[PDB]
């Protein structure tokens, strides 16, 4: 179920929670409530970035796995000679 974007949005919210707990400051103080969209928004911004680098990592290993088979497939071809 792990959406790369929903997780990192949830991740940013928990940093703000853990921050206030370590600082021993009240959670859900009303004038500071903006930090949860902000920490949460930054986490989503990171998640969009990860999603992009994940697309780039799938290709590079997809090319590599092809390149391994091709290296292996032509190796046995010369053996049958």
């Amino acid at each position: 179920m792990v959406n790369r974007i929903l997780f990192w949005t949830g991740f940013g919210l928990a940093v703000r929670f853990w921050q206030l707990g370590i600082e021993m400051r009240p959670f859900f103080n009303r004038k500071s409530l903006w930090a949860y969209p902000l920490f949460g928004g930054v986490g989503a911004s990171f998640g969009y970035w990860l999603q992009s680098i994940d697309e780039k990592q799938t290709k590079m290993l997809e090319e590599r796995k092809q390149a391994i088979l091709e290296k292996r497939a032509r190796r046995a071809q010369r053996q049958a000679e």
Binding site: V2, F11, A14, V15, R16, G21, I22, K31, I53, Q57
Partner: protein, 558 residues
């Protein structure tokens, strides 16, 4: 960029003796390291084992660039300790965006923020740190024997000066002195190692020695015995600096003697740079065919060291009562796992080695941050223990003992849970990130027939888990020896804070007490992120693990 940043920062530093500038010189250094990140990020769009630069003297690899960027982030995170004041005053009346961006808060902060503390008054501190980073990054990129020696020196000399930059501390001068002397012995081994290579081979190029080594791998007058045992002497000089046993004795003493904000950077960066440099050497010197040269591989020192680092690190840590001596022995047992993955040279073990080094460097940094923050939290707390009164240099190492942490879960519970998660991650407990690191290195070693070293490591870990649990047992199982300060919380003494608007006009005056004094956000956010990375690694492992899958594929391909 790092060299322009050093020269520019040095010109500004050289026309001031104002100690109030140290905080802003540290804030500019973080900006400088962020440009270095933007530049090594742009340089990442090529697939190559290596590209010779600057007349063959330097090289760039995808592995070389991902590691400089990591060093730059780690340096930005450590540089935060000298860039922001430890404590803070927070009120709900100053908590909105308009408040932060358009209002000002006047109050006496000299004592609350420790404005004139030692960490805030050394003008040259970021500058000496940038030189160590300059030396670290140059070493990862070194392609020549002469380049290696100059780069390890530029890294080492700065670590001696950082260990001695607190000049009014008899404890730092001593730690600095031990480190300079025994590291100078370490460098004389490194110079002998390089010198024997050039003398027998006629070349200073690492690229030329790897070629001579690969030809000599066949299956009568000049058998290349020199490569394996010149590299052995060369290797011992680097096992001193990573503090792998049996060359580890200095690190517990030096790390315990120097201040804790300093021991954070000195105990982390040298390992990342030195281990990455050794990785390329181990890959390009491995004889795939079994041979007489294989019987004498310089890499058996690494197995002997990893073996010894496992036993020594966990056992001697059993009876350590000093928290900095405990943290250093924990490092000697973790560099044993790193060494074991570096000595089995295989795709799986190189992935494991790369993952372990990054995760341990972020985890050991969390451990240092929590430790530093815990001893800045004790500002509104008081104790009556004779031992805590008999300590030395309490300003440079606020927390020196494990027992000083007794009952910390009753003073601040989440910071105590953060340290519990980090310690449990050093143990190797799932589903934390440290378990996965340890499992990846065990999986690689089991696959490659190192069954005996795998058995040592698992038995070793249970021994090391004993002293990790004594730390947690201290946090959770007893009561605090620290008490709220009776006058900072007395309901009769309160300082006046006053809130002004965008143009020097008063809005509201406030009276504040000690319960309105908290950790500054940059440290609580940093601890919060690393704790949650460690905690939730299982839901966020794909991009990090794939980054190491691809780097190993480039190193072992073609």
């Amino acid at each position: 960029m790092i060299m322009i940043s050093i020269l520019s920062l040095l010109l500004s530093t050289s026309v001031t003796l104002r100690r109030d500038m140290s905080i802003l010189f540290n804030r500019i250094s973080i900006i400088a390291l962020a440009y270095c990140i933007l530049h090594d990020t742009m340089s990442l769009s090529f697939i190559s084992k290596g590209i010779g630069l600057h007349g063959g003297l330097l090289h760039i690899t995808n592995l070389t660039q991902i590691f400089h960027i990591f060093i730059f982030i780690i340096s930005i995170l450590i540089l935060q300790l000298t860039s922001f004041y430890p404590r803070k005053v927070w009120i709900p009346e100053y908590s909105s965006l308009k408040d932060i961006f358009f209002n000002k808060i006047l109050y006496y902060r000299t004592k609350i923020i420790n404005k004139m503390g030692e960490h805030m008054k050394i003008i040259e501190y970021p500058l000496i740190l940038l030189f160590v980073i300059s030396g670290a990054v140059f070493l990862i990129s070194t392609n020549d024997l002469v380049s290696i020696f100059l780069s390890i020196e530029l890294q080492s000399y700065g670590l001696y000066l950082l260990s001695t930059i607190y000049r009014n501390s008899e404890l730092s001068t001593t730690g600095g002195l031990i480190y300079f002397l025994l590291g100078g012995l370490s460098s004389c081994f490194i110079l002998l190692g390089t010198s024997l290579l050039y003398v027998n081979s006629g070349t200073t190029s690492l690229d030329g020695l790897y070629i001579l080594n690969s030809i000599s791998d066949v299956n009568s007058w000049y058998k290349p015995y020199y490569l394996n045992f010149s590299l052995l002497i060369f290797s011992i000089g680097f096992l001193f600096k990573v503090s792998a046993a049996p060359f580890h004795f200095w690190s517990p003493d030096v790390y315990d003697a120097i201040p804790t904000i300093v021991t954070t950077f000195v105990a982390i960066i040298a390992k990342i740079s030195i281990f990455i440099f050794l990785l390329e050497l181990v890959y390009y010197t491995n004889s795939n065919a079994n041979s007489y040269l294989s019987e004498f591989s310089w890499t058996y020192a690494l197995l002997i060291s990893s073996l010894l680092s496992l036993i020594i690190g966990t056992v001697v840590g059993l009876t350590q009562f000093r928290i900095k001596r405990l943290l250093a022995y924990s490092t000697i047992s973790h560099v044993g796992f790193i060494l074991l993955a570096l000595s089995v040279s295989s795709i799986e073990s190189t992935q494991a080695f790369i993952f372990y080094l990054i995760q341990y460097s972020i985890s050991n940094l969390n451990a240092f941050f929590i430790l530093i923050t815990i001893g800045f939290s004790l500002y509104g707390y008081v104790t009556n223990n004779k031992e805590y009164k008999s300590l030395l240099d309490k300003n440079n190492s606020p927390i020196q003992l494990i027992s000083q942490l007794k009952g910390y879960f009753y003073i601040n519970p989440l910071l105590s849970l953060s340290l519990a998660i980090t310690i449990f991650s050093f143990v190797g407990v799932p589903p934390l990130v440290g378990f996965f690191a340890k499992q990846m290195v065990l999986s690689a070693a089991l696959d490659n027939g190192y069954i005996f070293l795998s058995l040592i490591a698992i038995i070793t870990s249970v021994i090391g888990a004993v002293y990790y649990l004594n730390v947690i047992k201290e946090i959770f199982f007893y009561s605090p020896e620290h008490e709220v300060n009776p006058v900072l919380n007395e309901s009769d003494s309160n300082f006046s804070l006053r809130i002004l608007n965008e143009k020097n006009v008063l809005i509201r005056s406030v009276l504040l007490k000690g319960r309105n004094i908290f950790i500054s956000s940059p440290f609580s956010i940093t601890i919060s992120i690393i704790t949650n990375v460690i905690l939730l690694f299982i839901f966020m492992n794909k991009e990090w693990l794939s980054m190491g899958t691809i780097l190993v594929q480039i190193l072992f391909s073609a």
